[PDB]
Write an enzyme that holds these catalytic residues in place. Structure first.
Site, short mmCIF file in Angstrom:
data_model
loop_
_atom_site.label_atom_id
_atom_site.label_comp_id
_atom_site.label_asym_id
_atom_site.label_seq_id
_atom_site.Cartn_x
_atom_site.Cartn_y
_atom_site.Cartn_z
N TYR A 237 0.80 -1.23 0.00
CA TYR A 237 0.00 0.00 0.00
C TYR A 237 0.82 1.26 0.00
CZ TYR A 237 -4.15 2.76 0.75
OH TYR A 237 -5.26 3.59 0.56
N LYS A 246 7.51 8.51 -0.52
CA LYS A 246 7.94 8.88 0.81
C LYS A 246 9.34 8.38 1.08
CE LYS A 246 3.95 10.81 1.78
NZ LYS A 246 3.75 12.29 1.88
N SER A 288 -0.23 14.94 6.86
CA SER A 288 -1.27 14.11 6.27
C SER A 288 -2.62 14.42 6.84
CB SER A 288 -0.80 12.61 6.48
OG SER A 288 0.61 12.55 6.27
N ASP A 313 2.20 17.33 -2.80
CA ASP A 313 2.68 16.49 -1.63
C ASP A 313 4.20 16.61 -1.34
OD1 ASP A 313 1.73 14.30 0.30
OD2 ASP A 313 3.27 13.19 -0.83
N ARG A 407 -7.67 6.08 -1.62
CA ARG A 407 -6.91 7.01 -2.50
C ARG A 407 -7.32 6.92 -3.90
NH1 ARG A 407 -2.89 10.46 0.28
NH2 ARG A 407 -3.08 9.62 2.47
#
Ligand SMILES: Nc1nc2c(ncn2[C@@H]2O[C@H](COP(=O)(O)OP(=O)(O)OP(=O)(O)O)[C@@H](O)[C@H]2O)c(=O)[nH]1
Ligand SMILES: O=C(O)C(=O)CS(=O)(=O)O
Ligand SMILES: [Mn+2]
Ligand SMILES: [Mn+2]
Ligand code: NA
Length: 618
Positions: A237, A246, A288, A313, A407
């Site tokens: 995920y 990230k 977030s 982001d 998402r």
């Protein structure tokens, strides 16, 4: 690359390659692929070319295997439903490996670090050997060559992700620039090594839930910055498996940025144009679930203003030789939270996500569209809903139809407000940086820092209501993402003031989330946040629109355009209470002293002292 020497035929994987050629790869890319194929034992190796024929073949493969379903209402959109144990990026299973712990997190004075999770080399070795040997048996290892940033940009960097998940390949084609052109640009250059497995070798030892392979008990997302490697096991995920996002573009990249003189930040980037035809770029760091995507794609309510999106982001920023802080979005798409997305909250996302988009853990309507809490758009009489748990669903069920972290994954080049410089290799010049989070009490709608040092303290001091409630610390919105010791990251930020010629942005802090005594939001937010951006714009131009307070500059009375918002409880939204702020600075002080301790820069300690002093004179 060349064939490894063999006494038998056990090291050369050429016979298992079903797309591409190991001989075509750069030597070090071959050695990464083949060395990990030796360890993980995949049945086949697919070297991705990024073509539309590949992508369509992959999507068909997943659809045949029941891994995704086609959303027949839209153009080339798809839906994946996960095991409910694998629904989010997982910080408790995320680590950084360095020889000395202090390189990764400050040694705290009294408590456990909340600024990272260090694992020693020896513990990681044990963990690695308990997970990866044989873990791809019976599966394809996909080789994904990708660039973070426009292919060739001076700020761009290349990775190679090995994965056994075709969902990861399809999502990485949207979120990164992927395929053969990246291998050609890389040549014999350096690259970030990204290894990913879902952790479910065949034959399956454990039950498969919803056609979604994962291994929650062994999940582990590791980063080895000295080796330039990212190794992730057990989750399919989001930020655990799309390793460019990230793991690379925040955790590895923030440490390379410290080494090399730039910044890697959890920030949107937007361009805003005013009614006098002037345009400025802003960056903003919110945790977030605190509205970066809504701001980055805003549709402003004020006439004559325009917002365009460069990214939503992650930002990579570096001063150029002229002293401008230039930023790029290293991503190629938006990986946005779906629930709450509506025409009221994000009409430009609604536009974007109806073609070429993969959805994860949303509800499906019987006519092949998507649904979630907060969509605020009714369905025709007759249309039914399948929840993200694959069950018939109605509102009298108490549980949500979409998982709260579900998402969309959508191409950035489709957004109808994508900025015309969003892929410019030189990046865009940032004139303001905005911090903020969810604060139901005490913190006003907007303020401006007094100096660059004060601004770095305001990033450091960020706190946000956890999403009984708890007010968490999340400095710079980077708490889950620091690649290295936060104290040194503060020093790095502070050092930008000592570069000759630097044109430092103005720093602001916002709060969209202040509530009155009855728990109602004081500010309407969303596109009305354009009113706050107009004030920040004028500020950057030097307009005489601020008043000094103990926490920084705020708008003068009458300085915000509140036409159409005369109804707002302005007293409460902008009020600053000595009692609240005396408590706030005490919490900030206790946090920085424990969690940053011997690595807290002087200048941050001095700004804490000066804020305590200004509050004491109220
Ligand atoms: N009250 C209010 N809520 C907002 C505003 N902007 C966004 N939100 C809320 O913020 C949440 C949406 O933000 P997310 O998409 O989760 O936030 P993000 O920062 O993009 O998160 P990541 O993609 O996980 O980094 C929903 O709860 C929204 O209602 C605003 O102006 N006011
Ligand atoms: O958690 C975040 O800040 C995200 O953007 C989602 S993920 O990419 O971490 O899954
Ligand atoms: Mn987002
Ligand atoms: Mn994020
Ligand atoms: Na599924």
């Amino acid at each position: 690359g060349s064939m490894p020497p063999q006494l038998h035929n056990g090291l050369d994987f050429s016979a298992k390659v079903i797309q591409g050629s190991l001989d075509s790869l750069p030597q070090e890319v071959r050695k990464f692929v083949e060395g990990n194929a030796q360890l993980c034992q995949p049945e086949y190796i697919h070297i991705c070319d990024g073509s539309e024929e590949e992508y369509g073949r992959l999507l068909a493969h997943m659809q045949e295997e029941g891994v995704i379903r086609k959303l027949k209402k839209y153009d080339n959109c798809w839906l994946a439903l996960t095991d409910p144990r694998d629904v989010a990026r997982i910080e408790s299973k995320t680590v950084i490996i360095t020889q000395e712990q202090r390189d990764t997190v400050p040694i705290p004075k009294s408590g456990q670090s909340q600024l990272g999770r260090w694992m020693s080399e020896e513990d990681f070795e044990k963990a690695f050997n308990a997970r990866f040997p044989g873990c791809m048996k019976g599966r394809t290892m996909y080789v994904i060559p990708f660039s973070m940033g426009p292919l060739g940009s001076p700020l761009a960097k290349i990775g190679i992700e090995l994965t056994d998940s075709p969902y990861v390949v399809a999502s990485m084609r949207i979120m990164t620039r992927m395929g053969t052109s990246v291998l050609e640009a890389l040549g014999d250059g350096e690259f970030i090594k990204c290894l990913h497995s879902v952790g479910c070798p065949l034959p399956l030892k454990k039950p498969l839930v919803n056609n979604w392979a994962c291994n929650p008990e062994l999940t582990l997302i590791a980063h080895l910055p000295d080796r330039r490697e990212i190794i992730s096991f057990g989750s399919g995920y989001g930020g655990n498996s799309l390793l460019g996002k990230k793991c690379f573009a925040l955790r590895i990249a923030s440490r390379l940025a410290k080494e090399e003189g730039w910044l890697a930040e959890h920030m949107l980037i937007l361009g805003i144009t005013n009614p006098e035809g002037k345009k400025k770029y802003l960056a903003a760091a919110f945790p977030s679930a605190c509205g970066k995507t809504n701001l980055a794609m805003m549709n402003p309510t004020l006439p004559g203003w325009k917002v365009e999106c460069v990214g939503d982001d992650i930002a990579w920023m570096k001063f150029d030789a002229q002293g401008n802080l230039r930023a790029i979005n290293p991503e190629n798409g938006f990986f946005g939270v779906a629930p709450g997305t509506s025409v009221k909250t994000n009409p430009n996302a609604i536009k974007t996500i109806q073609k070429n988009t993969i959805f994860t853990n949303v509800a499906e309507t019987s006519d092949g569209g998507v649904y979630w809490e907060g969509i605020d758009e009714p369905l025709a009489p007759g249309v039914t809903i399948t929840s993200w748990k694959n069950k018939e669903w109605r509102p009298q069920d108490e549980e949500p139809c979409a998982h709260p972290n579900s998402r969309f994954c959508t191409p950035a080049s489709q957004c109808p407000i994508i900025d015309p410089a969003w892929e410019s290799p030189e990046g865009v010049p940032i004139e303001g940086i905005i911090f903020g989070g969810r604060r139901p009490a005490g913190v006003p709608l907007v303020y401006e820092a007094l100096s660059w040092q004060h601004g770095v303290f305001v990033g450091a001091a960020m706190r946000s209501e956890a999403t009984g409630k708890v007010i968490m610390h999340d400095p710079f919105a980077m708490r889950p993402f620091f690649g290295y010791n936060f104290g040194k990251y503060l020093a790095h930020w502070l050092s930008m003031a000592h570069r000759p010629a630097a044109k430092l942005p103005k720093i602001f802090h916002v709060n969209w989330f202040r509530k009155d005594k009855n728990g109602k939001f004081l500010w309407p937010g969303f596109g009305e946040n354009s009113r706050v951006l107009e004030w920040m714009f004028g500020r950057i131009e030097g307009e005489d629109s601020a008043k000094l307070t103990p926490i920084g500059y705020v708008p003068k009375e009458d300085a915000l355009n509140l036409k159409g918002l005369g109804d707002v409880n302005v007293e409460e939204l902008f009020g600053i209470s000595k009692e609240f702020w005396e408590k706030e600075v005490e919490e900030i002080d206790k946090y920085l002293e424990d969690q940053v301790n011997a690595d807290l820069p002087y200048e941050i300690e001095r700004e804490l002292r000066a804020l305590k002093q200004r509050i004491s004179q109220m």
